[PDB]
Amino acid sequence: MSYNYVVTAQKPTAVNGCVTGHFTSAEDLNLLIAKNTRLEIYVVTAEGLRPVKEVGMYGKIAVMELFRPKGESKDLLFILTAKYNACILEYKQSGESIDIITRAHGNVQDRIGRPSETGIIGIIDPECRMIGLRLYDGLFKVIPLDRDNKELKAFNIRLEELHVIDVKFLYGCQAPTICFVYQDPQGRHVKTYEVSLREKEFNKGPWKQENVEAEASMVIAVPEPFGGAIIIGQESITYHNGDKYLAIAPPIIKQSTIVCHNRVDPNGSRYLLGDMEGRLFMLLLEKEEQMDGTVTLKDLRVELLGETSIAECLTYLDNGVVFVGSRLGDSQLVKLNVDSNEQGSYVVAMETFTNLGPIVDMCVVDLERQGQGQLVTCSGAFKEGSLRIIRNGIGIHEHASIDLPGIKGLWPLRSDPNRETDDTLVLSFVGQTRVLMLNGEEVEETELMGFVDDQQTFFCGNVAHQQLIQITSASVRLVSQEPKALVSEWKEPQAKNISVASCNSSQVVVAVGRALYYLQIHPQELRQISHTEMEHEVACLDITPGLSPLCAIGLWTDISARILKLPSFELLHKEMLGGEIIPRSILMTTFESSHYLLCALGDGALFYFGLNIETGLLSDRKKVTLGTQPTVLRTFRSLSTTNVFACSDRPTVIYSSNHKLVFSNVNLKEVNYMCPLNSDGYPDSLALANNSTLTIGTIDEIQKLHIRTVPLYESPRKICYQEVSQCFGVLSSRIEVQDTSGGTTALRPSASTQALSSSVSSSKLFSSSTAPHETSFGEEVEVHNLLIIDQHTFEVLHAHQFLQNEYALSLVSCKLGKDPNTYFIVGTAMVYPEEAEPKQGRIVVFQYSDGKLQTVAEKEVKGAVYSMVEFNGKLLASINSTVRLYEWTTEKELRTECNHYNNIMALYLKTKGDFILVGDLMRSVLLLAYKPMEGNFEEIARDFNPNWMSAVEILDDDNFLGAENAFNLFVCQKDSAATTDEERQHLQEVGLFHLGEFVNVFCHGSLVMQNLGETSTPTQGSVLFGTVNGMIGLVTSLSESWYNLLLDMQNRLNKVIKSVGKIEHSFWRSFHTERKTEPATGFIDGDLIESFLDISRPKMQEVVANLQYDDGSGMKREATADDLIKVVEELTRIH
Amino acid sequence: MEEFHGRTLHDDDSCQVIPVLPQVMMILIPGQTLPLQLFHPQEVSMVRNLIQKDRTFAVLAYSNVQEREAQFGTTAEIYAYREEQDFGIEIVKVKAIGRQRFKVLELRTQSDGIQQAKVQILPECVLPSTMSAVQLESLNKCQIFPSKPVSREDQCSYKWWQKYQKRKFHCANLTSWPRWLYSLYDAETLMDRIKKQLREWDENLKDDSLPSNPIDFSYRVAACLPIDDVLRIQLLKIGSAIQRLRCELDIMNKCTSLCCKQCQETEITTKNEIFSLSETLTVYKACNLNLIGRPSTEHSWFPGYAWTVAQCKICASHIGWKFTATKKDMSPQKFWGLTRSALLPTIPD
Ligand SMILES: [Zn+2]
Incomplete structure (x- = not known):
């Protein structure tokens, strides 16, 4: 009853796990990347990475490790979907038909059990005897590996230590022994268990428990001949081998926590370590003690190879080439030419793969063609935050x-x-x-x-x-x-x-x-x-x-x-x-x-x-x-x-x-x-x-x-396009360390301190206040700005820095009342850490004219301004929980007109015409209407449902689309034709979907030349949206007959197209929530429908046996196997 | 008393029909014991039959007492019941504990005398961590915390909670909203907010006086805090732990007026007038209080503050002391250190 059609106009770009091995052949060195529902298989070469095959799998990838059981030549691949759809893939090519066959598949979910806060962990026995899994706290799941285990039957094993941080298998052991660190009220310990499949239970470990740092984080197993395990925390790196114990406390790793690791030598003599902020250490193991033939350590020296992108998953290729993936930066290829030492840094960048994620906010701008819009996303975060410009086609x-x-x-x-x-x-x-x-x-x-x-x-x-x-x-x-x-x-x-x-x-x-x-x-x-x-x-x-x-x-x-x-x-x-x-x-x-x-x-x-x-x-x-x-x-x-x-x-x-x-x-x-x-x-x-x-x-x-890139070296938050001045407006936030003498020191030279005309806000309307807990030395403080960027050169013209301890949330560029100029209006929000809910806020109104940002008007509100919009020249701001509508006086001073008090936090504002849509993180969607005669707000409909809502958007006066928890989408439609007041006062839920990507922002428009030539329209809209990983989808409405036809065709395709891992499409797109799950309705998978053109002609012939694709006159049930192609081609043209 | 060891847990969203005792007329939040003694032979027989069958009762809290119509209620289970025949009258004393919330779809009056209603047991939905959706694969291992250090020596506990908010909500930089916003939707942070703010009105040790489960803690604090019945019904409407805690914060911050503990009507001060110049709450001003005795500055806790006894005007019971300045050029001139135990607080109306 919704009839929407969601399609992906950009594949996800954030890398969430990479691994190397021999997968496509017994001699090649492959590199596999989950990005993130898409597996990318490369072949490592002396010149770089050669792509081989793209593959879209019906699931979010969370575990990816290669293993080689006895007998097989090329290593298999184990993938665990976030929905717990396990599979054991295997590369298979016959001349041209490159196919990823599924040797075994199954579901490893359990009926009862809260998912672990530490998340899914998947490890494999070095001898390839079984696969470990920690899906739920206090329940270690084991999948035995055998030639006859096609259903992946897994038996749980009870773990007494509920809070397990990291677990990995050890090398050089007869039986498969695990080694993990668990948190208990005493502290943090390390324990070893010996897993026996005959008993289906643990046993006594090789070496007894020990004590480690209070913040030891990860376990990194060391292979033969050294054996044992190494545990690295925030302060020290400790190596345990039973009676052998080495501890080292270098002063280099104190700045940041090590999050990701890697091995480089096959015998484990050297290791890579990348910390949070984005520098790349390198751990070296000294094998100089060959006491009795067996190799034992003497020292645990640590080095530093310089700074790279913010690492999330390293991997080591051949000849000193490291692929430094990044969930929020840009994937890199750095050469470890450690013998060069040009300026103290050891790495040298070679490549840089584009990564649109994370996207925080965007807008549609008519830049060059004047008939097609362009998308301006505030990509990146931390020191990679930058603007991206997206356009369709070459020029x-x-x-x-x-x-x-x-x-x-x-x-x-x-x-x-x-x-x-x-x-x-x-x-x-x-x-x-x-x-x-x-x-x-x-x-x-x-x-x-x-x-x-x-x-x-x-x-x-x-x-x-x-x-x-x-x-x-x-x-x-x-x-x-x-x-x-x-x-x-x-x-x-x-x-x-x-x-x-x-x-x-x-x-x-x-x-x-x-x-x-x-x-x-x-x-x-x-x-x-x-x-x-x-x-x-x-x-x-x-x-x-x-x-x-x-x-x-x-x-x-x-x-x-x-x-x-x-x-x-x-x-x-x-x-x-x-x-x-x-x-x-x-x-x-x-x-x-x-x-x-x-x-x-x-x-x-x-x-x-x-x-x-x-x-x-x-x-x-x-x-x-x-x-x-x-x-x-x-x-x-x-x-x-x-x-x-x-x-x-x-x-x-x-x-x-x-x-x-x-x-x-x-x-x-x-x-x-x-x-x-x-x-x-x-x-x-x-x-x-x-x-x-x-x-x-x-x-x-x-x-x-x-995808043009404009580096800023600082995280952007919001963005807007001001047409009259032909310039953008973008917030930012640069982290600065607290000065010993009182002040702030910039970490790195960013785009906020390198502007042409950099001013500083001085309107101390709100002042005094309290801060008894003085910021100690070394603490981090966020300093906000407001950059003005020209459209056709992308250089920060102005950098207006806001007050101290002031946080900017909203930003709107529009004209108000009868004034002919267009003003930047920023709604900031005061904050100190001692107070939880902010009490003071500002609504400042700038105006960028003649290259100088001059404040025009100022207004102080007792609360925090969360979001703002424009009504016919009237500014609406949502302070804390209330909703306030302002009037722009002729004397350039905002004036309140009418108030409406809600019991929820008015946090999401999206409007069109007169209807006002209000929501919050708890998915308490609410509706309002503004009657000009009364000049007061009225409530039309409400809908409350506990869930972690993400973003909301208006598709029409009836449909209210919006993302929510567990990566889903939903559509709320108001029944304006209801007979009674109560029935029309409730928002019915009609649409549901499992997009699999966390949406962040919604914006109208489309990246297609809609200038003219509207030879009717099957689709009746376009609503772009970005996500944390990077994809840019497009949700467009559809007619009833078209929706029914596409639903029939989609249900027919699932019986023909073979999915990798044999995950049922209806299960992948099912509306998934931690407490309940129901099938998706009212949405058409754009990726699957547009896949209709990839399958060969005979498969299309079975797909189209009945009974549609013609007008009502006769309906031509045969469909001629080509009438639906014309339908699909029309649907592909929207993006 | 005849003890019971069974536990009742009805299926969520499953309709159930059970009679409601006419004696119960107040709102009973789940987890709050509501002992009741019934002397009516019909009521005693109904209680015995219920105990034999499932030991389950329905307490429909009517919105209007006169109307006797209830749109919401709670289901209670009898833990221990005693049937004592005192003075020839069948009297049964039972200490019951709430089980789950229920919504009364329809109310009907049975011929025997009890009221029969079909109520669907509303479910208690627990949300996951707000940061779990956008959590990073590399940073899961850092979620586990280095124990939970706590002590009166730490006092403020500022640094620990700043580290908690900074690193637990680290992934909030990938989403459009900042970390200080999600801290308002975090169960632990809200629980700390109630626990610290409650200790401003009593000296109970927060370590054990309150539970640790967010649902149990929310129910306990909802029952404990002084509040009217309509807002109790409003809280019972909320079905989410985080939403209930936020509503409790909203209600709690509106208790700006203190009052004499066992006196109700006599207000003593306003929260906005609390002058923390230098335990006992310090108030710059006071009202409806009378001084007692003389400014015996001997062994004064605050140097330069000659303390004199003070009491409620309506009761004459001690409510605090008036710290009068011992010098002409001393500020503040008079600080009222009212006792913490002696205060309600209450709404500003
Ligand atoms: Zn009194």
Whole structure:
């Protein structure tokens, strides 16, 4: 009854665990990454990381460790979903079909038991005899590993020590022995148990218990020959081996707590340690005591390799290359060239993978195209906090502009000594041909000696062997290169008109009637050595070599594509291009990572095909609607390698990563013809000619999404776009250590202390107060700011620093009342640690004019201003629990108008028109309405349900979407048609989902060119949203019939598509809460529905047995297996 | 008394029908014992039948006593009951303990005399840690705490709780809200807030006088604090431990007016007037109090403050002492150190 459709427009980017081993093969060194529902498998190489396969699994990954049981060559993979969907995967490839088969699978959840506060822990016996799991406190779950254990039957083992911090298996033991540290009222101890599968219970450990630091955190097992375990805390690193005990208390690790570790040497002689704030120690083990052959330690020295990104999971590749993952920074590849020591730091960055997460807030901005929005997310945190700009498609930076009467063809011309620089541009009208020679920016037309004046030119190229050819409708005219005069002319034997012509370096073939003529270009001459007749008229042809192994021609009267040897009439193969229309153009190049051949039909489709080097023809049947008009394909040198420009109604640069092809739509309204432009004044340009005018310029990239980064070195909180001043406004928070003499010292030079005009707030309206607990030396204090950033240069123009012990929460940029200026309005909130609930707050109103941030008005409120919005020029702020509506007086001073007191904390404010939506963390969603006549608030509906709500958004006057606890989504709809007051006063719950990602903010708009061309709308909205991990989804409404059809198709897909780990889709998307779980309703999985185009045609055939995809008249239950594809393609266009 | 060892735990969201004793008319929060003695033969027979069947009773707290209509109630289980025939009248004394909250869907009067009502047992939903959703995989091991140091020597306990809030809510930097906000939704922090704020009104040792389970602690503090009946019903409406604790904080901060302990009406001071110049609460001003004796400054706890006895005007019982300045140029001139035990407090109305 909700009919929404949630789709992912960006894969999650936060890394939450990485591991290395031999997975894809018995000799490769693989790197596996959970990012986070997506497993990325790489192959380590001397140059970097080579991706192999992407795989989406129906679950959040929380355990990932490789093991090699006896007999197997390549290591398996054990994955434990956050929903407790265990599996044991295994890489399997047969030539091309790379598949992740599931050797065993099952569910390890228990009916009763509170999940441990320390979270899931998964460890594996070094001998690969069993797998340990600590899912619930005081219950150690063991999964035996055997060839006949397909259901993963696990038996619990009772643990007396409830509070277990970290547990790992030890090396060099007969029976599998575990070693863990547990918290008890006495302190923190370390205990060892011997696990026996026959008894199904623990036994006496190898060495008895001991005592460690009060804040010992993690256990790191040391392998043979050393044996034993090492326990590292906040102060010291202790090594235990029974009767052998080493303790070291270095003064380097005092600053921060070690959180993640790694091993580098196979024998454990060295280790990596990365602390919280983002520096990388390295633990070294001294094996200098070979007392009786066995190796024993003597020292436990520690070193420091410098600073990197904020580490969350290290991993060591070969030849001293470390992949420093990060849940909130940027994943890095640092080289441990420890023998260089350039400035005391040992690491040197090599790569930096983009990571949008965490996202705290965003907005939609019309930046360049004025028709498509762009997303500005406040990514990062701590010392990585930065702005990101997201846009759809590539862009071309124009260098020159010129207008022509509807150009219908263009081609570079060179009339100078060979220097790879083009000085002339040859245009082509419907019948006229203007040869414009412009060394600089000239527009005059000067026909060449061999160039005709008006002949409707079909080709204009630069031939080899010192020639310059210009083929027109009448005949091909050859002009010498150095003489620059017409020296040859080979008219058609029948003196007829040539329809299709192709120009190569040394060969030229034109189409005369239904026959094909081939002419070979000689020094200052042309000779024809081939002639043939085709069954039907040739719609188009293209021969791309010296000697072309084969040439392709499309049958206009047969709508079929065929290839044949270029210097003869020897056909090779043929295929039918659907029969809809004659092909418009055909081309073959290495744009699609292989020597593929592409043919474009007159209906706007583009059937991809794959050719070979000598002689090879395939089908590769795939009809993707690149446009709604005939498309001309041309390849430009200024690309990654070559790429292909598929000029059409929506021009797209046809890309293919390494084996899968996706059309990356360009940010242009329409393009009719294009050609590469290599000019001395504008190198690597691309002369694009539309139906109106022409222009040239270079392309940006070939990526689907471009993510510009603006580092700030400080965590941003909120953001807004002020249109009038054409600048942003963003808060921040920089951590500064308390000074010994009284004051604060900046930790690092950030973007708040490096602004142009940096002021400091001095309006001590609220002052005095109490702070008896003086901030001791070494304490951390947060200092807030308000940065002003220009849109098209991204440099902090102003940095207004707020008062001491003042916290800024809200931020809005809007005009108020009848005032014509636009003001920044920031609602801050005073705080001291002694008091829990803030009592004093400010509502300051800035105005950025002439490069200086000047305060306009000030207002003090007894409370904390949490969120603020705008009503028709009236500012609404929610102080503590109340809701206050302000009026902007003519004298520039806020004035309260009406109050409404709630028993909940008015913390989330989202509004449209008159309805006011209020909520809080406990998901106490509430509604209000503002009647202008009374000028007082009224309550329309309420909904209270205990749950950790995250964010809320208005989809319409009826639907109230919002995330909540356990990564879910929900939709609340008010029944305005209810008969009684009570029924209409309650918010019904209609939609439920398990997104699996913690949403942070919701914003209207879409990153698609919605400028015009609204040929109706299946989807009726777009609501972007970011998450902590990094994905940017899109929730859009749908019609009833469309929702029912998509639900039927989704239920049919689940019986066909094989999920990795065999996790049922209905179980993955089920609305999951710690206390209850019910199936998801009212939502359509965008990822699964759009996967309908990836499965092969036969699978689609079984999927579409019934009974829809047509209008109500008849309903065409057969659906023809193609009608649903048109439905899916429409749904893909929204993002 | 006939002891009972069984425990009753009805299924959540499962409708149950049981008669309600007409004698009970007050709000009984779960966990608070409400002994009652019934002399009516019909009531005694009904109690005996209930004890034989399931030892369960329903106490429907009517919103209006005259209307006798209850939209909410609590289910109680008899722990120990004694049937003593005193003076020829069947008298049964039972000390019962509350079991769970219930919502009265409909109330009907049985022919025998009792009232039969079908009530669905509302569930007690426990939320997980507010930071568990966005918790980091690396930082789980740091959640476990280095014991719980506590002592009167630590006094303020400022540094420990600052470390607690700073590192427990470390992951709050990834979410749009700051750590000091989630501290308002944390069970332990709220429990400390009640425990510290209660000790301002009594000298009970918070270590053992109150439970540690958030639900049990919330019920105990809700029963203990002085409050009217309508706000008791309002608290009973709340079904979440965190929400109930927040409501208790909201109510508690509105008790700005103190009063004589066994006197009710005579207000003695306002919370805003507490002048912590330098145990016993110090109030700058006072009202409805009369001085007693003479300023015998001998062995004065506050140097320069000649102390004189003070008492409630309406009772003449001692409520504190008036610390009069021993010098002309001494400030404050007069500080009233009212006794902590002697105060209610109460709402400002
Ligand atoms: Zn009194």
